[PDB]
Structures are given as structure tokens and as C-alpha cells.
From Swiss-Prot:
Record-annotated SH2 domain positions: 10-96
Organism in which the protein naturally occurs: Candida glabrata (strain ATCC 2001 / BCRC 20586 / JCM 3761 / NBRC 0622 / NRRL Y-65 / CBS 138) (Yeast)
Entire-sequence positions represented here: 1250 to 1345 of 1449
Localization: Nucleus; Chromosome
Family note: Belongs to the SPT6 family.
Function: Histone H3-H4 chaperone that plays a role in maintenance of chromatin structure during RNA polymerase II transcription elongation thereby repressing transcription initiation from cryptic promoters. Mediates the reassembly of nucleosomes onto the promoters of at least a selected set of genes during repression; the nucleosome reassembly is essential for transcriptional repression. Essential for viability.
Protein name listed in UniProt: Transcription elongation factor SPT6
Protein origin, superkingdom: Eukaryota
Length: 96
């Protein structure tokens, strides 16, 4: 239910990178979605709006633990869940 939490997340949209850009066009600077990625080695990504017609894209890496399920890795900060990720990209948008 790691998979279940990610895919049904309110900020998760089943978009590719182009469509995420398209959706962000009518949003504001710093808005973002978690969306899908057909490469991989990662099937998740973040896309967010830097400015009018300018976007950033980042891969979300999904790895296992070996302890007690999965762990998200974005530019090399580890996270459990999308939630901690959403928190930071909202604080990002905030400091504008």
C-alpha cells in the first residue's frame, strides 16, 4: 500500500512531462504535480513551474529498506512518503 498511497495522492496526477507542463500553464509559479514517467528507471517524477513557460522536472527514485517498505529519493534527500516531499515543494512555493 506504498503503491496505493503514491498513486491516489491528491498531488499525484497521471500525466507525462508534457501534460504536466500543460496543466501547470494555468497555475502559478511554484505549483507542481507528482506525475508519471515512462523511462525508467523511475516511474515517478516532480514537475513544477519556475515561470511563464518554464518548468523543472525531477525523477523520484524508489528503493527498498531492510528493516522492520519503500523509500523515495529526490536529488539525494531520502523521504518515506510523498507527504514529506509535498511539504517541501509547498514551502518552496511559499518563500516567493
Amino acid at each position: 500500500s506504498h503503491m496505493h498511497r503514491v498513486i491516489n495522492h491528491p498531488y499525484y496526477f497521471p500525466f507525462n512531462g508534457k501534460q504536466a507542463e500543460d496543466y501547470l500553464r494555468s497555475k502559478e509559479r511554484g505549483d507542481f504535480v507528482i506525475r508519471q514517467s515512462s523511462r525508467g528507471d523511475d516511474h515517478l517524477a516532480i514537475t513544477w513551474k519556475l515561470d511563464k513557460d518554464l518548468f523543472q522536472h525531477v525523477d523520484i527514485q524508489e528503493m527498498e529498506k531492510e528493516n522492520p517498505g519503500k523509500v523515495l529519493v529526490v536529488e539525494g534527500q531520502r523521504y518515506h512518503d510523498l507527504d514529506q516531499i509535498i511539504v517541501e515543494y509547498l514551502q518552496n512555493k511559499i518563500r516567493l
